């Protein structure tokens, strides 16, 4: 998380941290608990290549990484069939947990939006994660979960910004309709934040507007962060997730 502060213990109970085996079960992506048996993440975290599930664990909402860890096994990885790369699109995936989580005050699910939801600029949105604090700058120990309020930008406005200082033809779409834009040069998500949630307050409820996907650098001029538009893939999510 570029910009922003350390999240309070209470806030973001749906926040998960994806782990990879090695000298330790190291954090590499974030995700959200959308059901007691399901996690919503970015396809690029776990694909397009088939991954050995022995090498993956899920860690539920905790304030700091590695201090009070209780690693949960994954039984299935479901990557959207249309996914190859983040810039192409369909950077969305589901993890089915081997055991259902016992939901509580500190650990519970995030609400997905209706299809009709547009998430226009002005919307109070927040992105959360344990990823890079700046370009090629890791989150230092004690690894607190970070939060940043990011401004929503319209797709055409964002796509126009993405063309500034680029050879790519103006008629050539960069920001695709399955994508969503948020951030500026001071507030943004970064590498290691992928899969994590972009939530917005809509009539007193937190709805996951997006999934941390890609972007050119981290909080770079005319390069807002690009998130997968959750509304676009609702039908696919609900084919698996109750």
């Amino acid at each position, epitope marked *: 998380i570029v910009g922003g502060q350390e999240a309070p213990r209470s806030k973001w109970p749906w926040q998960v941290s994806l*782990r990879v*085996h090695g000298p330790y079960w190291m954090h590499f992506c974030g995700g959200s608990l959308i059901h007691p048996q399901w996690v919503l993440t970015a396809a690029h975290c776990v694909g397009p290549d088939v991954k050995d599930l*022995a090498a993956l664990r899920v860690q539920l909402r905790e304030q700091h990484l590695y201090y009070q860890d209780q690693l949960l*096994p994954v039984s299935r990885i479901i990557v959207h069939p249309q996914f190859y790369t983040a810039q192409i699109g369909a950077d969305i995936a589901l993890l089915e947990l*081997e*055991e259902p989580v016992n939901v509580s005050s500190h650990v519970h699910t995030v609400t997905l939006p209706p299809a009709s939801e547009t998430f226009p600029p002005g919307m109070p949105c927040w992105v959360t994660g344990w990823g890079d604090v700046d370009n090629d700058e890791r989150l230092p120990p004690p690894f607190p979960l970070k939060q940043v309020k990011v401004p929503i930008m319209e797709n055409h406005i964002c796509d126009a910004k993405y063309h500034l200082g680029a050879y790519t033809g103006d008629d050539v779409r960069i920001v695709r309709d399955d994508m969503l834009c948020a951030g500026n040069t001071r507030r943004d998500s970064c590498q290691g934040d992928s899969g994590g949630p972009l939530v917005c307050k809509v009539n007193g409820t937190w709805l996951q507007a997006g999934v941390v996907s890609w972007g050119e650098g981290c909080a770079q001029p005319n390069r807002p962060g690009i998130y997968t538009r959750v509304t676009y893939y609702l039908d696919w999510i609900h084919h698996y997730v109750p």
Partner: antibody
Amino acid sequence: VQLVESGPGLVKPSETLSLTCTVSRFSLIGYAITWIRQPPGKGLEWIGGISSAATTFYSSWAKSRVTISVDTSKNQFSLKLSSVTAADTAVYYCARDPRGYGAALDRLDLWGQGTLVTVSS
Amino acid sequence: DIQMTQSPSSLSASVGDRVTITCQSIKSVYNNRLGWYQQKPGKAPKLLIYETSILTSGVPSRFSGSGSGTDFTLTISSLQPEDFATYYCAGGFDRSGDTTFGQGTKVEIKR
């Protein structure tokens, strides 16, 4: 990496056999340990197991008379089998599921050396 | 505690012979959750094949796993004298306790 079974070799009937699996030069944080037994000359039988998330799963038989636990501080896993008969005389194994499953059997990569438990008066 | 059938229960084959051990169940295997073990006398079983067809690293290429659902096969393309052991298949039908081992197959060398 090594797994070691520890416990009494001889148990009188009606009593409770208590075994421990200890995991040297590694603390398996994201892993699961299952217990398997093998009557002499007979085949492999699953007793039960504990998951990556400390969840216990017990076989059809046993269930009622079996208890599996973890002492992370000691790097130990326990097995307690009450009201033992000569039918419980077997070689007791503890094995690891590298996916940290708890109720798996199809991918037991690391195994203990096995411990013979004889139930006799 | 029987849910999976190995065939044969014991077999005898010459060195260099192709050996086929089949593992069958009435319920279908959960998520390709079928592994093969080799147990040499007085030793803990060894995982040879896991998740139906994946070979444990270091295990010779003469060992291969095949099949799906309810019917599976362990193949030993050219049986070696060291390959004498009891072979066990083991499967999972759910994630909460419906897992068993097969009967076992004692593979004997013919000389």
